[PDB]
Design a protein around this ligand. Structure first.
Ligand SMILES: CC[C@H](C)[C@H](NC(C)=O)C(=O)N[C@@H](Cc1ccc(O)cc1)C(=O)N[C@@H](Cc1ccc(O)cc1)P(=O)(O)O
Ligand SMILES: [Mg+2]
Ligand SMILES: [Mg+2]
Ligand SMILES: [Zn+2]
Length: 662
C-alpha cells in the first residue's frame, strides 16, 4: 500500500516518516492528482445550484492525498535530497504544473465561482471568495483558449527550468567546497571551526583533510578570521563562481519567459505582475523606496571602506573586507569573534534564548520528544503548548549543514492549521550550521543566532494560526509581509535581559561580563554600510531581471550593467547573491520580491518601538501581537491588521535609524 493514502495517525498528524520510502512518492502523486482532478470535475459539473459550500469550500476540502505527499516530498527535496528524489522531481514537477493549470483553466469551474455572491458570508468567507477569483484570474482563467494553450507551455517550461537551476546549484556548490591539506593554512580560525572542517572532510570522504563548504550568500564567514590571504581569495572566488556557466543561459531563459507570461496576463513586466499581489501598491512605490535608501547606504559603505583601508594600512580586495572589519571591532569594542563564540552554544541558545523569549512573551512551553521520529536522525521534535496547558502544535528543528541540504535557512509546514480540517500546525526550521565532531559543542556566530530567531519567527507565525480555511493558514500572506514576523522575532536575540540569559560560557556556565555584552551589542551597528549595500544591490539586481525593456544576451553582462545603472557596482561590496546563485529569485518565490525583506523591515522596526512604548517584554504585549497579527494568517488584509495592532499606518524612520540612513 502507501502511507500517504490515509491521514497520519501520529500526534498532530506528524507524517509517518519511519514508514515512508522514496518508492511511495510517484504513486501517491499520481493518486493525489487523479483524486483531486475527479473532485474538481464533480464540483465543476455539479447539477445542484452553486454555493460557497459546494464550490469554494469544496475546493478547499479537495486534494488531501496530494497535500500529504507534497508536504513530505518538498520538505525532503530541500532538506535531505538524493539522486532518486531529484529524478522524481524532474518527472513530477511538470505534471504538478499541468495539474494546477488543469484546475485553474477549467472554464465551468471558474464560471461557477463567479456565480457565488457575498451575501450572508462571514468576513473570512467573503475574503476567501475574492481570493479565489484573484487566484483564478492571476492563473489565466479569463484568457482565450489560444492564450491559455501558450500559458500552459510557458508555466511548464518555467517549472522545469527552476528545477534545473536548483539541481545545478546544489551540485556546483557541493563540488566547490574548499579543500585544505595543511592545517597551517587555517591559521586564525577558531579551534572549534578547525574541528568542524576536519569533521566535514571525514563526512565527505576526505579523511585527514579540512573542508570549508560554501554558505548561500556571497560573503563566507571564515574570511573574518583566516590570516592566509591566498586562501581568503580562493574561498571568495569559489563563492562568486557558483552557477557559472551552467546557470547563465538558464536564468536568461527564465527571465524571458516570465516577461512573456506577464504580458500574456496584461502586465508590462514580471514585477508589475508580482506587485499586483504584494502589499506594495505599485512598482513605482518599490523603486521610490529603494531610491531613497540607496544613496545614504552607499555613502556609509564608502566611509566604512576608508576606515578599513586605514586599519589595513593598504588597499583592499573583496576578500579582505570581513578580515579587516573584525580587526576594527577588536580594536574599537574589545570584541574578538573567537572569544564571542564560546558564549553561544546551540543547546543554550535554543533553550535559554529562542524558547525562553517565546515563553516570556507568549506563555507557550516546549517538551522535547526524542522518542518521536523526524525525517532525518538529527531533527529535534518538540511539542508546543499554550500557557493554559492546551496543545498547540509541533516544531521540528534541523540545524546542520550537509551535502543533501540546500544552502541558507528556511521554514516550511508539514501540516497547515485550519478549522475546516481541524488540523494543528506542524512546522519545520532548517539551518546550515557546521556540525562538530562527536562530543564537541556547537558554537555559533551571532549571525547564526539571529538566523535561529528569524526562522523561529516564521515558525510562530505558523504555530499561532487560527484560520478557518487552509488557503489562509499560517504563513500564507504576501511575500513583502511574510518577512515581518520573522524579522521582528530577531528583536529577542538582542533584547538585553534575554541575551543575558543565554550568552553564557559553554563550559563554565559563566555569564559574559555585563560591560562586554554591552559592547558586543554595539559592534552590531557596525558595518551597516556594507550590510545594507550588499542587500540593496541584490534587490536591485532582482528588480532589473524582472523589469527589462529588451531581453539580455548575456547573464554576467546584464548583471554588471544592472548594478552600474543602479549605482551599486562597488568592487568591495558585491551583491549578497550574484545572478547565477540567486536561489531566492530563480528557484523559490522571491522573483521581483527580494525587496520584501526591507519592505517588511519597516514593520519590524516600527514594531520594536511599539514594544518599548508598551512596557517591553510582557505577556500582555505578546497576547496582543498574537491576537491581532500572528494568528490571522492570510485571513484579513495584512496592512489593516498592522494598523489595528500599531495604532496607525507604518513609519519608516525607525528602519532608517537602525540602518544609519537618516
Ligand atoms: C519549499 C518551502 C519553502 C522554503 C517555503 N514555502 C512554504 C509555503 O512554506 C518558503 O518560502 N519559506 C520562506 C518563508 C515563507 C514561508 C511561507 C510563505 O508562503 C512565504 C515565505 C523561507 O523560509 N524563506 C527563507 C529564504 C529562502 C528559502 C528558500 C529558498 O530556496 C531561498 C530562500 P528566509 O527568509 O527565512 O531566509
Ligand atoms: Mg536581517
Ligand atoms: Mg557598559
Ligand atoms: Zn524569512
Amino acid at each position: 500500500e502507501n502511507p500517504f493514502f490515509a491521514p497520519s495517525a501520529l500526534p498532530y498528524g506528524l507524517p509517518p516518516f519511519a514508514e515512508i520510502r522514496e518508492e511511495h512518492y510517484v504513486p501517491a502523486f499520481e493518486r493525489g492528482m487523479a483524486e483531486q482532478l475527479a473532485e474538481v470535475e464533480a464540483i465543476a459539473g455539479d447539477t445542484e445550484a452553486p454555493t460557497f459550500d459546494n464550490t469554494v469550500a469544496a475546493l478547499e476540502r479537495s486534494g488531501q492525498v496530494l497535500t500529504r505527499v507534497s508536504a513530505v516530498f518538498f520538505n525532503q527535496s530541500s532538506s535531505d535530497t538524493n539522486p532518486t528524489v531529484q529524478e522524481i522531481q524532474k518527472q513530477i514537477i511538470p505534471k504538478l504544473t499541468q495539474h494546477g493549470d488543469a484546475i485553474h483553466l477549467n472554464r465551468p469551474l471558474f464560471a461557477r465561482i463567479k456565480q457565488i455572491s457575498p451575501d450572508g458570508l462571514d468576513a473570512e468567507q467573503a475574503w476567501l471568495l475574492e481570493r479565489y477569483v484573484t487566484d483564478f484570474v492571476r492563473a489565466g482563467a479569463e484568457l482565450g483558449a489560444g492564450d491559455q494553450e501558450r500559458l500552459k507551455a510557458l508555466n511548464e517550461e518555467l517549472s522545469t527550468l527552476s528545477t534545473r537551476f536548483e539541481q545545478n546549484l546544489l551540485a556546483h556548490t557541493n563540488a566547490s567546497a574548499v579543500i585544505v591539506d595543511d592545517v597551517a593554512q587555517l591559521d586564525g580560525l577558531s579551534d572549534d571551526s578547525v574541528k568542524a572542517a576536519a569533521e566535514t572532510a571525514k563526512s565527505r570522504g576526505l579523511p585527514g583533510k579540512y573542508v570549508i563548504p560554501l554558505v548561500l550568500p556571497t560573503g563566507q564567514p571564515g574570511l573574518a578570521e583566516l590570516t592566509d590571504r591566498a586562501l581568503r581569495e580562493r574561498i571568495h572566488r569559489a563563492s562568486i563562481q557558483r552557477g557559472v556557466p551552467d546557470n547563465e543561459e538558464l536564468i536568461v531563459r527564465i527571465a524571458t519567459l516570465r516577461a512573456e507570461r506577464a504580458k500574456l496576463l496584461g502586465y508590462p513586466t514580471h514585477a508589475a505582475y508580482v506587485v499586483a499581489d504584494q502589499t506594495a501598491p505599485t512598482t513605482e512605490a518599490v523603486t521610490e523606496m529603494l531610491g531613497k535608501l540607496t544613496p545614504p547606504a552607499v555613502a556609509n559603505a564608502h566611509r566604512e571602506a576608508d576606515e578599513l583601508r586605514e586599519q589595513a594600512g593598504h588597499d583592499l580586495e573583496p576578500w579582505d573586507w570581513s578580515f579587516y572589519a573584525e580587526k576594527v571591532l577588536k580594536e574599537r569594542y574589545a570584541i574578538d569573534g573567537r572569544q564571542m563564540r564560546p558564549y553561544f552554544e546551540l543547546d543554550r541558545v535554543l533553550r535559554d534564548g529562542v524558547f525562553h523569549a517565546a515563553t516570556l512573551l507568549y506563555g507557550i512551553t516546549f517538551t522535547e520528544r526524542p522518542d518521536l521520529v523526524g525525517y532525518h536522525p538529527d531533527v529535534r521534535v518538540f511539542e508546543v503548548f499554550n500557557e493554559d496547558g492546551s496543545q498547540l502544535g509541533l516544531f521540528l528543528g534541523d540545524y546542520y549543514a550537509r551535502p543533501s541540504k540546500r544552502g541558507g535557512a528556511w521554514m516550511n509546514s508539514l501540516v497547515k492549521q485550519s478549522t475546516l480540517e481541524g488540523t494543528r500546525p506542524v512546522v519545520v526550521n532548517n539551518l546550515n550550521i557546521a556540525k562538530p565532531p562527536a562530543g564537541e559543542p556547537t558554537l555559533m556566530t551571532f549571525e547564526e543566532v539571529n538566523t535561529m530567531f528569524h526562522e523561529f519567527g516564521h515558525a510562530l507565525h505558523g504555530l499561532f494560526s487560527e484560520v478557518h480555511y487552509p488557503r489562509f493558514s499560517g504563513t500564507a500572506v504576501p511575500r513583502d509581509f511574510v518577512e515581518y514576523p520573522s524579522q521582528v522575532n530577531e528583536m529577542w536575540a538582542v533584547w538585553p535581559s534575554v541575551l543575558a540569559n543565554y550568552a553564557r560560557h559553554w563550559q563554565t556556565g559563566d555569564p559574559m561580563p555585563k560591560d562586554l555584552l554591552d559592547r558586543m551589542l554595539k559592534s552590531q551597528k557596525y558595518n551597516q554600510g556594507y550590510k545594507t549595500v550588499e542587500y540593496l544591490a541584490a534587490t536591485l539586481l532582482d528588480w532589473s531581471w524582472h523589469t527589462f525593456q529588451t531581453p539580455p544576451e548575456n547573464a554576467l553582462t546584464f548583471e554588471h550593467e544592472a548594478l552600474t545603472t543602479a549605482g551599486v557596482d562597488l568592487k568591495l561590496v558585491p551583491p549578497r547573491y550574484r545572478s547565477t546563485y540567486f536561489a531566492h529569485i530563480w528557484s523559490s518565490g522571491y522573483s521581483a520580491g527580494y525587496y520584501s525583506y526591507i519592505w517588511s523591515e519597516v514593520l519590524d522596526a516600527d514594531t520594536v518601538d511599539w514594544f518599548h512604548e508598551n512596557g517591553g517584554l510582557l505577556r500582555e504585549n505578546g497576547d496582543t501581537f498574537r491576537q491581532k497579527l500572528l494568528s490571522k494568517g492570510g485571513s484579513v488584509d495584512p496592512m489593516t491588521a498592522f494598523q489595528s495592532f500599531r495604532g496607525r499606518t507604518p513609519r519608516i524612520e525607525p528602519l532608517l535609524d537602525r540602518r544609519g540612513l537618516l
